[model samples]
Target: LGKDHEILRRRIENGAKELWFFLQSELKKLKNLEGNELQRHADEFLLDLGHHERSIMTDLYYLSQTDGAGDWREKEAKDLTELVQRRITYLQNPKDCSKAKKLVCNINKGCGYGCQLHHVVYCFMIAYGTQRTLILESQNWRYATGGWETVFRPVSETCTDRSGISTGHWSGEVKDKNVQVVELPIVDSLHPRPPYLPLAVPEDLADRLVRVHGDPAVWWVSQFVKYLIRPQPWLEKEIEEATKKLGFKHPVIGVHVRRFHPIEEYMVHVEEHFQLLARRMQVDKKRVYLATDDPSLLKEAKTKYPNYEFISDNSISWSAGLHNRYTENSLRGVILDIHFLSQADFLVCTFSSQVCRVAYEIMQTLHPDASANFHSLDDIYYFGGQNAHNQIAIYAHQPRTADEIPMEPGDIIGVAGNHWDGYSKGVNRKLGRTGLYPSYKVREKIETVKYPTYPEAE
Candidate 1:
């Protein structure tokens, strides 16, 4: 028994280190990995217990028959096999899932189209880390088609009779222990920490991946964003249709230009980045897929690069406010733009822009194996990092105090993770002070200090 425990401990510790290196290595080649290669990697991690060696499986068949702890060995093997089998069965016939850990959250306020999706993506990651099934509280903002789940898999009711995140529309009462209730400010902030953080145990492979890296809770939530989320069938088809409609040329470079930004401070320098991407790809300008809210910007793009061809849904009208954007046309337009931007061979956008971040999330989720050549004006790279929270540009959306985070509107700051409704865990980059602030007031900066261009060309 001592020997067995020794082997288990060593395997768990060393295996976690190996997984850390494995994922980081995979992250580097993620964009180039797709189709067969993508499936191959998934098979390596999802179908095998190589990373999860402590979970005795068929490989330890000999141990299951041993005289000492044969029953224990057998139980571990059975549990692991059933775990993987449950995942397979759920993907095949979701109704068959037996006992999966449940993760659920509520969207109280400041949950916009991109903001909500951002929350959902991380929830899935936390779920991945904890072996929990993620269920986001469906908010009033019906931005996506068939709601948000139409673009991705919905939380299974049969996974467990669990409930959390209560609001006027939802019952706040705790119902079942099978389901774990995760409250928001999803990630750890200066004030109250998330309940899920303490629940994270080192034995769990997911928890080890985070703790070994010395990252806050946001690290786990954002790091696993790529692997867990998948698009539903119709949403997949819609992206394909948008691809054809946009007439995206091969080696397509997707450009997301955000409107209403300070021109010189934020929007002005993006064209140079686009130009760099074109030069890197060594393609003519026409191959660029331009998606933007501002028609004037698109017009400016065409004028600046006469030879470059820009594609966009020109029919969209921006007059509809966020509260009134429930109509099919408005909803689909945002979805179309984001998905279309995601299909780009390389993406250039501002991380501060919710739309761009949403597109970034979608691209990663859609192509977990492929490493999209992502660029930003702020030099903040949002893709492929062990510490994902460090990758984005952030700011204060509202004013705050010296004790917390002090800032007026449009103040630049550093964001660690989801701060909650109208608030962000932020730092006054200049003042060197940090605390929670109204999220609406905090804005992430998106200008890329490091531009992505042709590697050889540079």
Candidate 2:
């Protein structure tokens, strides 16, 4: 409610509800409204489908780019409706679990979830024909909060939606008939939170939280705890193998270098950064394992600094999530570096969730007093966000020692993130593009400043 008007608050809140209704109510009409048909409707209503357009665009973008299917409130309502529909469908004719090909059940409400996983898992149990429970093979909680009472207690019935936090009891209820305990290894890569992860809940025991506390506060506390505490377990052995293969010595400091390498400006100054690093750390460069996505620069660095070791497969794009690495891959090959970084005394990181996530996991695998440096790209941005993102920040690393390093401008960067947006995401596309001040008269102002060649730029 607003300070001045509760009624206004009520009306505003209802507006979203109205949107929910509007989408369903007018979907057919909106879809069919083609051509210059607006002329026919302008007299009837000038309001237009502006709200619907915005929702569709926003939701579509979120789904495509971030795997977010709207927010939790919207998700909650949809889940309830789906469950009811599923139960009704299943009640018509029950079938045995073994008769089916697969049974999956996912419980939403966890932080650090990998987007699409929830859909397939939850939707399976809620399907018209497959309303059976998923017997968990194993239940893994990296660092779950709440003693038995808080985590295991039943707050409500699963059949009837109750805060949507009854997966544990629901699991127990269905365990005998279908799912047994299942393997769930908690992981906290970049932004680790729990309670939102998929876990089974039995309906019988779910009402404990609801009966004791009928308010939202009580509902939220448990949810927050679930998200905050649990995470997936990480492996030191995997870290060791990847590190050893690269010939990394113990106390290997993993320093991550990040720049906004839009395709056009990437090759230009990015290559210089490697030369700058070798100079900054000097002999210590051999003690660090550099991991990044700049392939041209990485190859160049290998030639320039033969003694230094690297372990990136170059198959992933840092800007896009892991899913982007699949199907529509942005990266070619990349490894989980924290495992290797574990041998290091510290982690020199960037603002990316990948590096930051590794830092947390690596440190957790260490003793309590373990120490490591975790810095985000913002730190570089502070030196100058634009300067850092543009790679000019490496000018700090210039003035080559013995002038042994070459500095160059390969791919030029711009402010936008996409070509249509005035930014480049690929080096090849922007590599040879021409630039200059144009003029209507006289051969383009007798162009002077030449585009620097690779070696010359260095």
Candidate 3:
């Protein structure tokens, strides 16, 4: 066992060196880029690194037990070493793990389609850290009964449509599974709390529990997510069909025209963004792959960008939970649209809409090297609730870091969360610090005049 460990260790260490070299090379090219564009690339780089770290740890765990996957292991190890490394972290620190065990997490709750995307991603992150498989509950979470399967591949072979435990039952459930379930209140105070990692669990018990309690939509994409999560095979087949039907493939620019309720006001900017993105990517209207919730939006897109090709289904766009119809086909349509968007080389969409956000995430995996540019429709127009109500007064909430701006009675701040949940990201202008705060704690601001209400200005 010791000899085998040493051999694997040497291989992984050498692989790490190669990976770092590749990573530095990529960073050097992006050194000239600035602001969010630069940060966006860096975040993607980290995500790829994060996934590589998880892969390395999983390999080590198996080597420690004198067992592992098949021939794929050698190839995976070889492929892994060629990948890039992150800032300072190398492969798994042997000092970190208290025990070797595989973990699995469940995605639950009453969240939007976009929020559900966030929820599943959150679960996957936990799985990566703990080296566990992820099990998703199909019913009551997104639509109902196998809805998620339309878009994503199964995280585990033993999939269940029946919903699982709540936040209250998580403790007992983890104990019953005979695996470790960590609760990090301090880290939870931070944005989208992830598992503390180096999971302390025994392999014999064979299971673990993690709940998606925090928001998953807060930031950039990670390659680690794609390492474990995958689109359903059927969905991929469908994407292939659409790609063939559309003709021409490389550099396809994906566009999402979000509409209904809060997002309706932002549709005007979609056309402008579509043109900008197409020009930037050097893609013409012919290669633009479009997906949107509102058929009206799609119609307008057809009229404006006549050459662009669009793939769609009959999924009627409804407000987050008000899916007036619960048919399997409509749910399937939602998955289909998301699948189409995922294949794009560049994503142009509104992030505020859950559908767009979910599609953007799926795109991240499909085009790990591609960047999704969310046009600042709301930020520039002040149409969204987050901006119009810029001055938010706080009630009470926990502060996790020094960067987090503290709140007090009658304190005013800016809406940093992009608006939606009770839990939000806010920044205090006076203190100049940013952190998560409860949405209920802040007072809402209403807009009397909705400027840029129409897209004609553009």
Candidate 4:
């Protein structure tokens, strides 16, 4: 199966390369033609290109089903996840709490769950980087008055104390002598930011992470989320019951509608996903798990798309409103939504929402590489307070249109985001120009930094 998966993956890659070459040559020739001649040639080329593109997509869809060498990849993902979890557990539970170096973080930040969760991950990254045991202070939590432990498990079983011999603030400096406890401000206010922030994976795990995941930095962030979001028994039960009730099944598409977009806009993508499956794999099920803030959208979706099955909980959507969004019920509702969204085989949503981003990050943990499992209508995948997201050009490209930019091989482009129209907006650092460029011409520049490997945990 793994060998078949590899062959299919290579076939798709080769098909893409062939398509790129054909399109480039055809477009060059079309540019030399004029008027009716150009129109005639362009139409012919368009038909040919569309057919080739669809064939490549068919192969790509098949490769996605193969799981990319499922057995070994699954084992590696599971083992690496467990290893990181064990390391985090070991770090949180120090032998001597009083003598251990600690990083104190307050989780009572006035924000949404997704934002708050990212804040927590940021603190954990600092703690992990500095080799300090994290002591999260969740008093007066927005969702629950009882704090984080009421909803989720305590980070450390043995050590929850925040007291140390001495305390100081992390002022961009790596270390301070005799400062046993360091308080970290929010990522926004943290001066002289550290290199080990989001979009930067730990150097020790980078090799394995890159091999097993498409987005290594996001995968690294997911490990922290996996450790932090250990739901209490009741919440877990609620999630389980909800999934069973909804009859959540494979081949279902997840749609998260945060902003007001016409139902037609989202459903178009949903239909496209199902159509691809139907044509390529003969998958006829058109099930959609719609997670939206507006309860009316669910009713609208069901009414407008009678042939399609829309699975959603109205109660969850009701609690997602701003009036009660910070309440305990809303927290559970959002958690349930995220759970369902992550479990989905494909997701169509705006990456601008922290909720969708969180779901996408969690989705990465469920598969070897789910980075391609999303279609963001707005921004590309990004952390809220991440450093520059750059992509290094692999193939040189000339400016073919007014909106397009020139790219040379090895040029670093500080990417803003993808337009999802075959182009991405970015500033080419080497050329000192900013404009749209072919997304396929470049690859993500993954940033990896050195951090404690936790050999003791192993």
Candidate 5:
């Protein structure tokens, strides 16, 4: 908050026009941004607004000094990114999904390993746990771990809550809103998902848990995270721009929607959730920032709720934005768009990874530092948005009640069972498959075209 807050405020501009320039800039900045900070500055937009006539020295110190997720955050990033290399195997060689198709989660129609992980934990409490001792009943253990992009990106492809997938011995309804997300309180949890799957849950560990809830039990790695938190001038500028554009100094509530799958295409009743979201975040002196990729959906949103300001992104090119992705040599991708969305204070999560899910993850880090209670979990995770209706809910956890899923042409829908296992091929190689990137044909309305924009000159 150093200089010309008003001028920077009035002059702020974010849209597709800045994409080309933003991308070129990211290429130059990308080399300098290393490790976790690479994800941070690229992911979050920053702009200064504390005062007028800002000084570079002050800007540098301000962003560097701002307390982040503290140390716990940086540690989480290390572990989190460590896992990414596994999930991103295809990026290295799109033609080699030979091992991918063999995964148990896909092979057993999702009743495999992943389902076992969620089911045993959920069933222990719903059926086995003593009501008095149970901290949460029938918790939600879905594959929704990744984040908001799940809203639109295919489910099997992403591992976020918004992926709209679930699997493994799910007998009845359970409260997903209050489930212990990732902590296993006692190893006493048993994986009854066996006979049909591999790797039985360690029964010895299960015997120890008098209480069946995921607990806060990881090595607090704030110090490790500190090792990653170094200051750089390039990111500081992005932060200043973002802060200035959003005017987000107060208690702002962040609004996230997953439109990876077009909101209209799926039989989802999402509008109702929007009503709830606006009311929830409409605190005086507090505003809403909507982050989404679909122009069509966002355009509709503007007509319906004009009060919310969309976190517009035109500074980064499609190639620059998807830079982290490897298999896109032919497509030219760059940037993890979610980085821009996290600049918000609070998030309203949805059932998609691309948008709301990312918001939830970032929000979790930003809030409560760390908590050991149900209310705290709920507070940190904001997931009360719309649901899919009559929509094919593929990639669901086990004991799925639905039957007969319909497949649509050109739809990269989610499905369980390693359809690609040991095939020595990629996702579409066997079916004489048309590439995932639909070239000749597209939604009748959208012609293949690229739009680029540049950030406002300093």
Candidate 6:
């Protein structure tokens, strides 16, 4: 079944390429026409070709839904996820808190909810790396006056005490064998950063992870997020009530328009998704789940795109503003948005917003491989304070244009971002130069670091 899926994927790629080739040849034939003749041919070509393009896109979407591996992938994902979660649970709830090593971190980062959540994830990564139990200090949290436990379950069930016999600050030079606890600052402020940060997965699970996940590093991060975000019963009930009130349903596309882009820009992608569904699946209900900080945009989208049904929480969007973003109500609003956004069939948003990124990360858990379920209008998926994101050249390339760079089979390129036009901007580390290169020429370079396997937990 897996082999069948692989063959189908290749066939889809080849068929699309052939269609593009046909379109190019037909377009070249119109160069001889002039004035109205040229316009007439171009308009007719688009009118006839649009249906086929939509049909092809629908086929691709369906292919993404099936991996042809039966349920093995799903089973493996669950098994490994459980293993990691159990390990974290064991690490946090030590048998003897006084004897166990501890890593102390504060959740008062003075940032938005997403940023603060990421800060906790980073601390978890450090704790996991060093085999220490994490002690999160979240008193007087900006979003919730009661701190982390008010919004989510406590990180440790058996231990919440911060006291230790001997404490040491995190540093590369100091190896305090006698230090029972270590203090860590924020990732940005850490004097000597650890190797087991974002973009790096545990070496013990890397082999199993790459086989089950398309983007293993992000999947690894999602595991910690899954553990950290065990919502309190009240918050969970609030989210459920909000979801019911909004009438959220399937066959819907999620649009998160941050302060960066206009509504029209987001609508274009939404229209494309709906068009594909209509062409292939005969889906008539064109529903959109719009999550935005600006309350006015929801009204604008409803008025401008009357043909499509827009579902959003006006109160949530209104409270999402900077003036009230730190309030408990605002935190509830963002949490509700992220929940529904992740539940949508597809997502179209700017990856620059941590809210959308969180949704995207959670979306990965819902599907076997939802790595391609997003369309980021601005940046590619990335963690804020991560190690170098590199792409390794699998196929060599010679510079074809002045703006392009050369590549060798084994050269590593530190990628900046993909242009979404079959090209990416990055610096070729081997030559020490920066330029454009074909995005398909290289693949992501996965980084793995040694972390405790927790054999007993398994």
Model 5: residues >4 Å from true position, as ranges?
Answer: 1-232, 260-282, 316-337, 351-358, 369-458
lDDT of candidates 1 onward, in order: 0.49, 0.33, 0.46, 0.84, 0.30, 0.83
CA lDDT of 392 in candidate 4?
97
Candidate 2 residue-wise lDDT, 16-101, digit = tens: 57766765655556566866785565433423444333444443333322323234434543443344334433332224432432
RMSD of every candidate to native, in Å, equals 18.9, 26.4, 18.5, 4.4, 25.3, 3.6
TM-score of each: 0.48, 0.28, 0.45, 0.87, 0.28, 0.90
What does candidate 3's lDDT look like per residue over 288-407, in tens digits? 556665657666656665655654454344333333444344555665566666665555565666666565555544321223244433321121111123555757555776544578
Query: Model 4, 1-458: lDDT tens per residue?
Result: 47777888888889989988998999999889999999999999977876677777887756755764566687888888888889999999998898999888999777889999999999998888888889999988988777888778998987799778888888654456468988988888788788878788888888898888888888999988888989877667767777778888878999999965787878877887676666666566689999999867888888899998888865643222442443466776788789899999889999999999999989988887887888888888888778898899999999988788999899999999888888999999987889999999999898888888889997
**Global local distance difference test of model 3:** 0.46
Give the local distance difference test score of model 6.
0.83
- lDDT tens per residue, model 6, 122-168: 99988888888999998888887777887789999987887788888
Candidate 2 global TM-score: 0.28
Model 6 is weakest, by summed lDDT over 10 consecutive residues, at 317-326
Question: RMSD in Å for candidate 4, one decimal?
Answer: 4.4
Model 5: per-residue lDDT, tens digit, 299-399?
Answer: 77556555545444444322224322422221111122344444444444443243343333333333332221111111122111111111122222221
TM-score (C-alpha) between model 5 and the true structure: 0.28
Best by TM-score: 6
Task: Point out the higher-scoring one by lDDT: 3 or 4.
Answer: 4
- Residue 81 C-alpha lDDT in model 4: 89
